[PDB]
Design an enzyme around this catalytic site. Structure first.
Site, PDB file in Angstrom:
ATOM      1  N   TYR A  48      51.076  38.315  47.443  1.00  0.00           N
ATOM      2  CA  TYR A  48      51.536  38.717  46.193  1.00  0.00           C
ATOM      3  C   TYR A  48      51.784  39.483  45.290  1.00  0.00           C
ATOM      4  O   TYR A  48      51.921  40.276  46.389  1.00  0.00           O
ATOM      5  CB  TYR A  48      49.946  37.556  45.214  1.00  0.00           C
ATOM      6  CG  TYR A  48      49.138  38.482  45.575  1.00  0.00           C
ATOM      7  CD1 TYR A  48      48.688  38.871  46.401  1.00  0.00           C
ATOM      8  CD2 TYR A  48      48.312  39.264  44.432  1.00  0.00           C
ATOM      9  CE1 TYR A  48      47.521  39.503  46.578  1.00  0.00           C
ATOM     10  CE2 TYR A  48      47.677  39.883  44.879  1.00  0.00           C
ATOM     11  CZ  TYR A  48      46.713  40.381  45.865  1.00  0.00           C
ATOM     12  OH  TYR A  48      45.672  40.910  46.617  1.00  0.00           O
ATOM     13  N   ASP A  50      51.281  43.742  43.742  1.00  0.00           N
ATOM     14  CA  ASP A  50      49.847  44.011  42.969  1.00  0.00           C
ATOM     15  C   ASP A  50      50.097  45.360  42.714  1.00  0.00           C
ATOM     16  O   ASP A  50      49.947  46.095  43.610  1.00  0.00           O
ATOM     17  CB  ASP A  50      48.683  43.612  43.489  1.00  0.00           C
ATOM     18  CG  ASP A  50      47.339  43.905  43.306  1.00  0.00           C
ATOM     19  OD1 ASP A  50      47.132  43.515  41.753  1.00  0.00           O
ATOM     20  OD2 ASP A  50      46.250  43.853  44.115  1.00  0.00           O
ATOM     21  N   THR A  58      44.502  38.557  54.301  1.00  0.00           N
ATOM     22  CA  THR A  58      44.475  37.420  54.571  1.00  0.00           C
ATOM     23  C   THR A  58      43.852  36.225  54.670  1.00  0.00           C
ATOM     24  O   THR A  58      42.706  36.270  53.012  1.00  0.00           O
ATOM     25  CB  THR A  58      43.105  37.613  55.918  1.00  0.00           C
ATOM     26  OG1 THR A  58      42.537  38.405  55.835  1.00  0.00           O
ATOM     27  CG2 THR A  58      44.124  39.321  56.249  1.00  0.00           C
ATOM     28  N   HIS A 111      42.044  46.630  50.980  1.00  0.00           N
ATOM     29  CA  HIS A 111      41.238  46.497  50.645  1.00  0.00           C
ATOM     30  C   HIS A 111      40.190  45.514  51.739  1.00  0.00           C
ATOM     31  O   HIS A 111      40.910  44.830  51.801  1.00  0.00           O
ATOM     32  CB  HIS A 111      40.747  45.908  49.701  1.00  0.00           C
ATOM     33  CG  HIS A 111      41.469  46.652  47.650  1.00  0.00           C
ATOM     34  ND1 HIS A 111      42.584  45.712  47.062  1.00  0.00           N
ATOM     35  CD2 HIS A 111      42.039  47.319  48.399  1.00  0.00           C
ATOM     36  CE1 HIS A 111      42.727  46.943  46.770  1.00  0.00           C
ATOM     37  NE2 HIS A 111      42.544  48.569  47.425  1.00  0.00           N
TER      38      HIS A 111
HETATM   39  N1  LIG Z   1      34.476  34.981  49.318  1.00  0.00           N
HETATM   40  C1  LIG Z   1      34.535  36.480  50.175  1.00  0.00           C
HETATM   41  N2  LIG Z   1      34.386  37.353  50.774  1.00  0.00           N
HETATM   42  C2  LIG Z   1      34.907  37.788  51.652  1.00  0.00           C
HETATM   43  N3  LIG Z   1      35.925  38.478  50.796  1.00  0.00           N
HETATM   44  C3  LIG Z   1      36.613  37.201  50.282  1.00  0.00           C
HETATM   45  C4  LIG Z   1      36.589  36.418  49.637  1.00  0.00           C
HETATM   46  N4  LIG Z   1      37.219  35.777  48.960  1.00  0.00           N
HETATM   47  C5  LIG Z   1      38.400  36.506  49.527  1.00  0.00           C
HETATM   48  N5  LIG Z   1      37.981  37.451  50.099  1.00  0.00           N
HETATM   49  C6  LIG Z   1      39.206  38.718  50.705  1.00  0.00           C
HETATM   50  O1  LIG Z   1      40.010  38.801  49.790  1.00  0.00           O
HETATM   51  C7  LIG Z   1      40.953  38.923  49.856  1.00  0.00           C
HETATM   52  C8  LIG Z   1      42.177  38.508  48.608  1.00  0.00           C
HETATM   53  O2  LIG Z   1      41.889  39.626  46.833  1.00  0.00           O
HETATM   54  P1  LIG Z   1      42.997  39.484  46.082  1.00  0.00           P
HETATM   55  O3  LIG Z   1      44.233  40.179  46.575  1.00  0.00           O
HETATM   56  O4  LIG Z   1      43.005  38.034  46.037  1.00  0.00           O
HETATM   57  O5  LIG Z   1      42.344  41.044  45.033  1.00  0.00           O
HETATM   58  P2  LIG Z   1      42.200  40.804  44.184  1.00  0.00           P
HETATM   59  O6  LIG Z   1      39.533  40.343  45.581  1.00  0.00           O
HETATM   60  O7  LIG Z   1      41.374  39.424  43.601  1.00  0.00           O
HETATM   61  O8  LIG Z   1      41.513  42.243  43.456  1.00  0.00           O
HETATM   62  P3  LIG Z   1      42.470  42.730  43.566  1.00  0.00           P
HETATM   63  O9  LIG Z   1      43.525  42.217  42.425  1.00  0.00           O
HETATM   64  O10 LIG Z   1      41.975  43.985  41.604  1.00  0.00           O
HETATM   65  O11 LIG Z   1      43.078  43.343  44.468  1.00  0.00           O
HETATM   66  C9  LIG Z   1      41.749  38.112  51.139  1.00  0.00           C
HETATM   67  O12 LIG Z   1      42.266  39.276  52.144  1.00  0.00           O
HETATM   68  C10 LIG Z   1      40.495  37.231  51.349  1.00  0.00           C
HETATM   69  O13 LIG Z   1      40.388  37.463  52.748  1.00  0.00           O
HETATM   70 MG   LIG Z   2      44.731  41.920  46.355  1.00  0.00          MG
HETATM   71 MG   LIG Z   3      42.014  44.256  45.843  1.00  0.00          MG
END
Ligand SMILES: Nc1ncnc2c1ncn2[C@@H]1O[C@H](COP(=O)(O)OP(=O)(O)OP(=O)(O)O)[C@@H](O)[C@H]1O
Ligand SMILES: [Mg+2]
Ligand SMILES: [Mg+2]
Length: 456
Positions: A48, A50, A58, A111
């Site tokens: 996505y 961001d 991942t 992250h």
């Molecule tokens: N319960 C969980 N515990 C640990 N890691 C997680 C969990 N759920 C998702 N993740 C990890 O978080 C990532 C997804 O993050 P995402 O890109 O959606 O950002 P976000 O957490 O929504 O915050 P932001 O959008 O502000 O970065 C994936 O790489 C995944 O491995």
């Molecule tokens: Mg993210």
């Molecule tokens: Mg993030």
């Protein structure tokens, strides 16, 4: 070892000869190029846009190795996506770099998410995490040419993200960038799990660095959850000490501790290390995982190797590997760190292109130690983790993707022909919906409606 974690890397994106091009747009065109803009991969991974950057999250993994595998897979995915973007009717040729800065003063984060017991006091987390995150850049640092956010500062540093954090604890905003992020979005049962959002890490090309980054942290998180740490590693001016460490590639500089003792980043990491060993020995004993001890020895070896010489780790660590490339150019061409070429080399190291990427050449030239095989990395592109709910999510999109209206970490929303309402099967449990739980079910189900029925 077992910890539920994930690595979301915001990939640096550039459009050559396109001053008009918008990050949001270029970032979207790439994410949309891979679609065949939030896209959930068959991988359980997430693609996505961001912060106007293409992002790869991942699937949830239970170990630092798989995290490494599916993060690397994300690189291959990003490269492929960027290539397809050029194939699209829209002519854009998009460069993607797995890096934390464009050296223009902009910083996008890689992250790292960890699943922790909600019962773990956040104060203990912050207390023992801060000192760890500040000093872990020793191995974890991708390395950066130029000092300060602007990068105009002449010099080489360990961390690409180090100069971009003003505050130690807080919520991550556009204005301020905390060492310890306060955002709690478990995407899992909130009472049972807390998702630790780690924004301080540099996106690593080196599979070892990522392994250690996730592994050592996972270790430290364990000790924090068991309240194992007796002492206080807290550092005065952690945010300053953070930059300080990064700003000294020699790792000579010692941090000042609220106990008064002075330690270098590496020494402090060693403190965490032996504490980590002392923790795993007390709990695991003989049953200790091969991976736990691997992360343990790799952590110890690295810190020892680092102490003696940083450059001997040039095959293992990004900042050392890059520094190798950089010091070469400098010796050969007699360039100050202020040399623009050094920044282009710094950037190019993270280039996702197999041919253009400096790290990628090192790998092809056998100059880097790989923790995983490209064959697995390829499979990890279309194939999710079996030990995590990512399996259910991933497999669903692959087989049932057509019938799926939307998917996320929290659920998969199917649309069943004949049902006026969207059917949502939440994946609340990261450890459920694995190959064991849903594996057979997903093999047998002929249709989504049939799958939704089985689950209901
Ligand atoms: N319960 C969980 N515990 C640990 N890691 C997680 C969990 N759920 C998702 N993740 C990890 O978080 C990532 C997804 O993050 P995402 O890109 O959606 O950002 P976000 O957490 O929504 O915050 P932001 O959008 O502000 O970065 C994936 O790489 C995944 O491995
Ligand atoms: Mg993210
Ligand atoms: Mg993030």
């Amino acid at each position: 070892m077992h910890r539920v974690m994930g690595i979301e890397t915001e990939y640096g994106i550039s459009v050559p000869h396109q001053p008009n091009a918008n990050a949001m747009a270029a970032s979207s065109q790439v994410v949309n190029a891979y679609a065949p803009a939030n896209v959930i991969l068959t991988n359980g991974a997430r693609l996505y846009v961001d912060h106007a950057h293409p992002e790869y999250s991942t699937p949830e993994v239970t170990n630092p190795r798989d995290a490494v595998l599916w993060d690397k897979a994300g690189e291959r995915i990003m490269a492929e996506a960027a290539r397809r973007a050029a194939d699209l009717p829209m002519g854009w040729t998009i460069q993607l770099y797995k890096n934390n800065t464009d050296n223009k003063g902009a910083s996008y984060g890689c992250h790292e998410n960890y699943l922790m017991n909600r019962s773990t006091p956040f104060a203990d987390i912050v207390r023992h995490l801060i000192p760890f995150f500040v000093t872990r850049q020793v191995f974890c640092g991708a390395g950066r040419v130029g000092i300060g956010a602007d990068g105009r500062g002449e010099g080489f540093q360990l961390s690409q993200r180090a100069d971009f954090f003003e505050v130690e604890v807080g919520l991550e905003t556009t204005l301020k960038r905390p060492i310890i992020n306060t955002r709690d979005e478990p995407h899992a049962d909130p009472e049972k799990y807390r998702r630790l959002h780690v924004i301080i890490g540099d996106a690593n090309m080196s599979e070892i660095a990522t392994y250690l980054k996730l592994g050592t942290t996972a270790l430290v998180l364990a000790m924090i959850e068991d309240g194992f740490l007796s002492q206080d590693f807290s550092v005065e001016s952690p945010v300053g000490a953070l930059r300080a460490v990064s700003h000294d590639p020699t790792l000579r500089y010692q941090l000042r501790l609220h106990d008064g003792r002075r330690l270098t980043a590496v020494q402090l990491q060693m403190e965490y290390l032996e504490q980590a060993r002392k923790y795993v020995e007390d709990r695991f004993g003989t049953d200790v995982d091969d991976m736990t001890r691997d992360v343990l020895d790799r952590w110890e070896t690295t810190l020892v190797r680092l102490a003696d010489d940083p450059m001997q780790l040039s095959r293992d660590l990004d900042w050392v590997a890059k520094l190798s490339i950089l010091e070469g150019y400098r010796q050969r061409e007699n360039l100050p760190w202020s040399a623009h070429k050094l920044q282009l080399v710094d950037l190019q190291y993270h280039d996702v292109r197999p041919d253009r990427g400096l790290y990628n050449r090192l790998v092809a030239r056998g100059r880097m130690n790989l923790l995983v095989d490209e064959a697995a990395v390829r499979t990890a592109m279309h194939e999710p983790p079996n030990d995590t709910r990512a399996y259910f999510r991933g497999r669903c999109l692959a087989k049932f993707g057509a019938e799926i209206a939307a998917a996320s970490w929290d659920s998969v929303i199917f649309d069943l022909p004949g049902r006026d309402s969207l059917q949502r099967v939440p994946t609340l449990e990261p450890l459920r919906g694995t190959r064991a739980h849903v594996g057979d079910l997903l093999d047998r189900c002929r249709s989504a409606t049939e799958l939704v029925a089985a689950l209901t």
